[PDB]
């Protein structure tokens, strides 16, 4: 009876189930080899590759899971693998997964339980710092040109204030430095809860507690991806998702609770005054950059712990569709969604099409709602930004654009046709010059507005200026909705009888 | 033998030969079934259909083709329609035939021949004005809420001066006697199933056909006036232009993808006061709407080819031109050639004002809402490098230059859905998605996809190996 959101070895065993995992039983070099075959994959939505042997791994460490939220064929649900995330049926549509992540918020908190030890996998094998050897795993290298081996792809930072009543969850790409080092960049909007603030008020910032998470349970991993609200806890509505307690044990050399059945566990300090220069990595734009940018906090690694077979995921992002823009859009998505029932506004869906690499947000509207506001493109334009912009919600967005309720949101050749065709060019959008910028976005950091890392967003409006006032009626010319239904569905029925195939 | 080029019939022909094209026997309604047909087969670039069994039609008037420059599966070569109306081999790409029209325009013009009507099958049945009754053709009513019935969509419209007008503009059935054209006893010619080269060319001009066929068009006067038209059209209609009596030209479904209602504005009315046609008349048709039909296809492509022509002359580093089909021919990519821009030794703000001062001043530029230059490190033929070049490759307005002062498009939905309809000024742009550095100098990033991520040979390995992995 498999729950693939609380097991990642069930989550491995229901890709297999349904013919969307390849057990590669063949020798592939983690240098380059890995990456690239996880990015054909990624390409043409093919399933993914488990590799159970490659260059340079022990027995144990490690096996490599290859794009764990990747999209895959239509007919076993494209993005069945985000679905196995939240235990969902696999034929949900991106859609209704958002809604269901909404409807998840409204659940009471459910936080973890711990678990005997002698009973957590990831307690299987214990490693004392003199055998922490960080430089003899199968570490992939992912990119050409990245400075350096990521092996925090996928996995969970999980840290902790001093007086242990805030355990923080979170991803960030985690590059090895050395046989005992990792160096992580975060990359976070400002004027939000630090972990090390806490640790540099009664000042021991040079050895905060860390542990380092793989293969954690999928809701889990699902969860701490993107941009939860200040007050709820991570864990506890990963409780939530799971209608059950998150099993937890406690760390060899440290107080922080760590998910039993994680597959790998890495423990240590971090030191904020202490760093290392962390060289590029290929981003969720689809570019590595050289230069390695200003220096990263140093990771002593000090001990560690993993199961039998242990398998590292990974995620290597480049060109849509990878989880970059399968994750992180879809969790942006969710709390712009949420954001602006809280505000009123008359927003129907909202959603981070993977084809403009989790740069545009597209916001479908309520006309009636729209109308009932009787306000005005200019007007409404404003009122939007502010909300989003201004707020931790559209830090990684660059573009939003608007849209009226005739257009399906997640299918991207509405949105192109609707962005295309609904806008004047430069007068029908808004810039926010004044907002903070997406320090990552390609024409942000290859351009001097890297260093004052301010405004280029902006509102788009691809609403017609009528549909501000009335109803507006015209006919969208293609097949399905141009003509009477039933003239559709005696044409579909005919069509192999005229002689299409 | 086949002539697909010169030959209307050998254009079907070649079509039937290649699977592209459905003979439909079955009776189909010209109300509104035509035309779903039609938007079914563009939308999934399926085969052509050509209805043989019209409800109205009479033994010779009409059958319709559609989808005569629509889009097909990549194995049979995608282009391969439009590549038929220059003669070209079906799987050259666009790019191909982008580059063989430039060429066309050095190849020596022949004038068309005329032949004797014994020898033009289009004379085969002459009809005088006493017989002439439009509405008991079966003449396609194309998407709801037209205006009408359009019998013009694909055909040619020939006008004189009184001592050579070659264009194609939609026409719309008034009455027994009367079409309206979209823009006192003028008189004009209008041809169906002429050369395919000749309606390319008068998409955006006779003697330029003669170098695109390398041959001259065989032509044969009308019956009420001295105006040439194709010997081997399907039909012709003869008559009087007058710019005195008008029309209300009710809407029709246009190919940014809207029938925008009630919405018209008066037209000259064309009578017809004579006809002739061969036997068994076929009536091409063009069904505007969502990418990918004629209008994007034909129209977007010739646009390139001028805009390629435009650059060269003007000395401006571009390497290929498109319009991609996505954005319904809104969208004029420019593909930059980096040492060239450096060459020129300029800044973004300067380019962008040189480019569009350039392109939207002429009227090469006037369909055109958004002009977008990139790297040459795009292939501006395929749409997944464009809107991942567009998206991150350029600042949302401050990487954007307005041009307002210029002509509009009118049928941009943009435009005439707002108060910029009473102008026709404005509303256009260049995006630069050109890299500061690259005005500068030489500079590498790695593109993090498969084929171009990786070392090729790694590429090579990976994909021979692909099979022995487990994959499919
Ligand atoms: C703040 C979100 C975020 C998403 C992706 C990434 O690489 C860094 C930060
Ligand atoms: C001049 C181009 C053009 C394209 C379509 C149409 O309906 C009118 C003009």
Same mark, same amino acid.
């Given at each position: ?102 409807? &998840? ?14 009973? #957590?996998? &990831? ?41 242990? !009543? ?21 990359? !976070? ?23 380092? &998470? ?88 000090? #001990? ?15 060109? &849509? ?52 506001? !009787? ?51 430069? #007068? ?74």
């Amino acid at each position: 009876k498999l729950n693939p959101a609380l097991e990642f070895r069930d989550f491995i065993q229901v890709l297999k189930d349904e013919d969307d995992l390849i057990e590669i039983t063949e020798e592939i070099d983690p240098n380059l080899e890995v990456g690239a075959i996880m990015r054909k994959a990624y390409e043409s939505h093919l399933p993914a590759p488990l590799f159970k042997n490659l260059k340079g791994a022990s027995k144990d460490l490690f096996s490599i899971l290859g794009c764990p939220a990747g999209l895959r064929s239509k007919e076993k649900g494209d993005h069945g693998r985000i679905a196995h995330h939240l235990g969902l049926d696999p034929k949900t549509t991106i859609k209704e997964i958002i809604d269901y992540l909404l409807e &998840c918020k409204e659940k009471e908190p459910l936080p973890p339980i711990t678990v005997p030890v002698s009973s #957590a996998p &990831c307690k299987t094998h214990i490693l004392s710092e003199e055998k922490i050897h960080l430089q003899s795993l199968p570490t992939p290298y992912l990119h050409v040109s990245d400075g350096g081996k990521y092996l925090q792809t996928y996995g969970m930072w999980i840290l902790q204030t001093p007086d242990k !009543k805030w355990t923080n969850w979170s991803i960030a790409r985690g590059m090895v430095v050395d046989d005992k080092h990792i160096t992580g960049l975060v990359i !976070k909007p400002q004027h939000i809860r630090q972990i090390a603030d806490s640790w540099a008020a009664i000042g021991k910032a040079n050895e905060i507690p860390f542990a380092l &998470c793989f293969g954690v349970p999928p809701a889990a991993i699902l969860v701490s991806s993107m941009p939860i609200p200040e007050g709820v806890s991570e864990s506890d509505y990963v409780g939530a998702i799971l209608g059950e307690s998150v099993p937890v044990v406690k760390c060899e050399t440290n107080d922080l609770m760590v998910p039993a059945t994680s597959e790998m566990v890495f423990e240590g300090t971090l030191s904020l005054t202490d760093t290392h220069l962390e060289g590029p990595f290929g981003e969720m734009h689809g570019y590595v950059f050289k230069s390695q940018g200003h220096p990263c906090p140093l990771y002593t690694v000090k #001990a560690m712990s993993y199961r039998d077979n242990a398998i590292l995921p990974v995620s290597n992002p480049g060109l &849509c569709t990878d989880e970059t823009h399968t994750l992180i859009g879809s969790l942006v998505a969710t709390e712009a969604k949420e954001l602006a029932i809280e505000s009123g506004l008359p927003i129907l869906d909202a959603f981070m099409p993977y084809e403009a690499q989790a740069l545009w947000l597209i916001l479908k509207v309520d006309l009636k709602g729209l109308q009932a506001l !009787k306000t005005t493109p200019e007007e409404f334009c404003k009122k939007v930004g502010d909300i989003y912009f201004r707020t931790k919600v559209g830090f990684i967005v660059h573009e939003i654009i608007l849209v009226a309720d005739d257009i399906d949101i997640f299918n991207f050749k509405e949105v192109i046709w609707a962005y295309v065709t609904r806008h004047t060019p430069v #007068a029908d959008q808004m810039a926010f010059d004044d907002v903070t910028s997406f320090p990552l976005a390609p024409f942000v950091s290859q351009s001097s507005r890297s260093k004052t890392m301010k405004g280029g967003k902006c509102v788009t409006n691809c609403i017609f200026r009528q549909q501000y006032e009335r109803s507006f009626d015209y006919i969208t010319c293609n097949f399905e909705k141009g003509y009477p239904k039933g003239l559709v569905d005696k044409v579909n029925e005919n069509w192999k009888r005229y002689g299409y195939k």
